[PDB]
Design a protein around this ligand. Structure first.
Ligand SMILES: Cc1ncc(COP(=O)(O)O)c(/C=N/Nc2ccccc2)c1O
Ligand SMILES: Cc1ncc(COP(=O)(O)O)c(/C=N/Nc2ccccc2)c1O
Lengths: 282, 282
């Protein structure tokens, strides 16, 4: 394949003509929401859950999506067909729109953009990644806003310090999530622990919590103190692109020998199970 | 007049052709900085101070402005001349640019946009405005990021509650600033008080602090507890558009009779003094 079209406000447009006027509130004021999901075998994965979150995020910024969910789903499928692709990354963006005063939102601009399935998608490396803690709390964390400035600004420091990612700790006390991932601990008794509050409710997080409970693991959704890293055997990320990704080091702590923990490897397999089961309903 | 041109990346472009490709990081990730200043008698006001802040904000997001300050100043003057206007609002935007991966910043896109001088600019109403307190702390507050989502999202609640603005209170404890203004108290002994930390260092704030000290007022730059509203005689905003704007009510508290306090009215006159003195050096 090669990506020929995006969709702006219900119209398929060649990628090279896909533009917004500079008065768009995303450009001037960072006012917008988005979602991102993969397609496999021609089907966006868990699509109803992603679209439900997109409509919920939009409601929290008082931005009306111009199409109902069934019509949005049609445009997404139509865009897969127009690009002639079965495997893809799909972005949805809803901006504050072409504001008259550079502040008051009006009709949003809706973007559907499409890319190759990321090469790294569900790599499931046996080698855990290395991350740093960073004291920070995302704004409006339950809403998928376009606001990624702390995450992006931290790229230089992350790379400088020999890490590939970070875990946000609210006031250096409470473990939350990374800029683009949910965060989980596995304790020595095999209890899975993940933040309940002041985080984005990831679609991957949902599927992994459900799979873990179906397998008979105890999954605690609660606040996690920074000191509880020392009680954990395993640490992992969930996200649309990562699936389940082993974390082998946080700051000066190696999780086991740095390689993927047993419950993490099991959750990887069960995640792939959830994906296969989804694609069987399509 | 009528505005004919903006400037994108050093090129004058008709306003109707001023667009960014949808891959721009401001659109996808809210990654960018900006500045906004007025021009009078053909001269952007306090321009060196605004441009210094623009370069400082850019450095904090690791975004390189493609032009040095003298060249940027030339483009701004050239754009005033091309639009044939002496009175204007001028926006500068520096985005994270056309990122290959929808996350890593590259060469920024630089926008210079121009509008009529706001009709409300320095209205200096004798009637104080009505504002609400809102518990919130801006991200990277010393940097003028494009991230205005809390401020914009609050518009509905502000208007619903019969207010026209808000004052952010960090953890409902520490008075900071509004979404677009610095915040000052005047005490009964005529001491002026304003936040020192975790706020944007406004150009208007600077000029008003300097003018107050020149007049022999005590100006304390310190943390302000929410309970100190009850010790204050006067409250006002500073911003590029407002100049000095009387606040007549915060929540259930009327400042005096709701009309502009004596020190606030004096600071308005001294602000206009600073403006006239600036325009005499041009
Ligand atoms: C703050 C935050 N927390 C968790 C997730 C994981 O959610 P899910 O399992 O539903 O993917 C994401 C995902 N971002 N995805 C993303 C962000 C930027 C660019 C590309 C993708 C996120 O932004
Ligand atoms: C957070 C914050 N705090 C203070 C000021 C006042 O700074 P100055 O006296 O230098 O104007 C501004 C100004 N925004 N200006 C602005 C924002 C959005 C749209 C238009 C103008 C601000 O954003």
């Amino acid at each position: 394949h090669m990506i020929k079209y995006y969709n702006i406000n219900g119209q398929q447009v060649p990628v090279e003509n896909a533009t917004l006027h500079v008065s768009d509130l995303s450009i001037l004021r960072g006012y917008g929401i988005f979602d991102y999901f993969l397609a496999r075998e021609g089907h966006p994965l868990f699509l109803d859950d992603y679209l439900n979150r997109f409509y919920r995020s939009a409601a929290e910024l008082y931005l009306e999506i111009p199409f109902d969910k069934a019509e949005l789903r049609r445009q997404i499928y139509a865009l897969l067909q127009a690009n002639e692709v079965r495997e893809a990354g799909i972005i949805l963006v809803l901006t504050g729109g072409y504001s008259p005063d550079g502040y008051t939102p009006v009709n949003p601009n809706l973007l559907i953009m499409m890319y190759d399935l990321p090469a790294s998608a569900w790599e499931f490396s046996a080698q855990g990644i290395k991350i740093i803690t960073h004291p920070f709390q995302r704004e409006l964390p339950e809403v998928k806003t376009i606001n990624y400035s702390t995450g992006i600004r931290m790229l230089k420091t992350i790379k400088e310090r020999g890490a590939t990612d970070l875990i946000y700790v609210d006031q250096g006390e409470w473990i939350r999530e990374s800029a683009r991932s949910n965060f989980f601990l596995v304790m020595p008794d095999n209890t899975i622990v993940t933040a309940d509050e002041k985080i984005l409710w990831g679609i991957t997080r949902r599927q992994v919590i459900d799979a873990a409970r179906e397998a008979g693991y105890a999954v605690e959704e609660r606040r996690i103190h920074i000191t509880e890293l020392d009680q954990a055997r395993e640490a992992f990320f969930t996200s649309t692109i990562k699936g389940v990704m082993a974390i082998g080091q946080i700051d000066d702590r190696v999780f086991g020998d740095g390689t993927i923990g047993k419950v993490t490897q099991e959750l990887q397999d069960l995640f792939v199970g959830k994906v296969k089961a989804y694609l069987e309903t399509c």
